[PDB]
Enzyme design. Sequence first.
Site, PDB file in Angstrom:
ATOM      1  N   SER A   6       9.686  24.625  85.577  1.00  0.00           N
ATOM      2  CA  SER A   6      10.801  24.662  86.557  1.00  0.00           C
ATOM      3  C   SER A   6      10.847  23.358  87.358  1.00  0.00           C
ATOM      4  O   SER A   6      11.952  22.962  87.751  1.00  0.00           O
ATOM      5  CB  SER A   6      10.726  25.909  87.443  1.00  0.00           C
ATOM      6  OG  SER A   6       9.490  25.920  88.212  1.00  0.00           O
ATOM      7  N   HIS A  54       9.390  22.267  92.601  1.00  0.00           N
ATOM      8  CA  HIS A  54      10.878  22.386  92.592  1.00  0.00           C
ATOM      9  C   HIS A  54      11.523  21.182  93.288  1.00  0.00           C
ATOM     10  O   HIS A  54      12.422  20.541  92.679  1.00  0.00           O
ATOM     11  CB  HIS A  54      11.380  23.683  93.248  1.00  0.00           C
ATOM     12  CG  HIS A  54      10.895  24.930  92.591  1.00  0.00           C
ATOM     13  ND1 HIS A  54      10.815  26.130  93.259  1.00  0.00           N
ATOM     14  CD2 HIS A  54      10.466  25.170  91.334  1.00  0.00           C
ATOM     15  CE1 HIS A  54      10.336  27.053  92.441  1.00  0.00           C
ATOM     16  NE2 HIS A  54      10.115  26.488  91.264  1.00  0.00           N
TER      17      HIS A  54
END
Length: 178
Positions: free
Chosen positions: A109, A162
């Site tokens: 991610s 992230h």
Amino acid sequence: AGPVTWVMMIACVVVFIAMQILGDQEVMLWLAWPFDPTLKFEFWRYFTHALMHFSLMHILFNLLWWWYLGGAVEKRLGSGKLIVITLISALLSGYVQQKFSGPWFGGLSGVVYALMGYVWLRGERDPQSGIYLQRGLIIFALIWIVAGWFDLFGMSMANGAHIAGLAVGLAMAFVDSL
């Protein structure tokens, strides 16, 4: 979806299977960000943390994004471009997450957030390229970064990875769209 898209999906699935059989820890022994300076020359570890997922939902979610955005990037800008975003985003998302979290983190991610920022800003500055992020997925991207700020889900989200991935993505979109 080109060969880089595919290979990555293969590698993640192979690694996930390995994890269910041997347990998460045994794979992490090989693939986690280096927890000890004796392991600093195991160069693959700065990247391979991106290949570990800790549940079926975790790998499904990550891989759906990877397939959609990675495939878009490989289809338009080439294998080499997807490889560079992926390798830089993995390294720097990993670097930031380990500061808060040491080795105890994993998944694609950080890379997906790089793909998000990259496709978003390039598509904003340089529509010519034919890559863009639907606002729906822009909105989705921002909500989870913001969700991360409040440590929801028993502090289960790699907030460092992230934001770092997004920074890298935006940065390389900026430089590229010059």
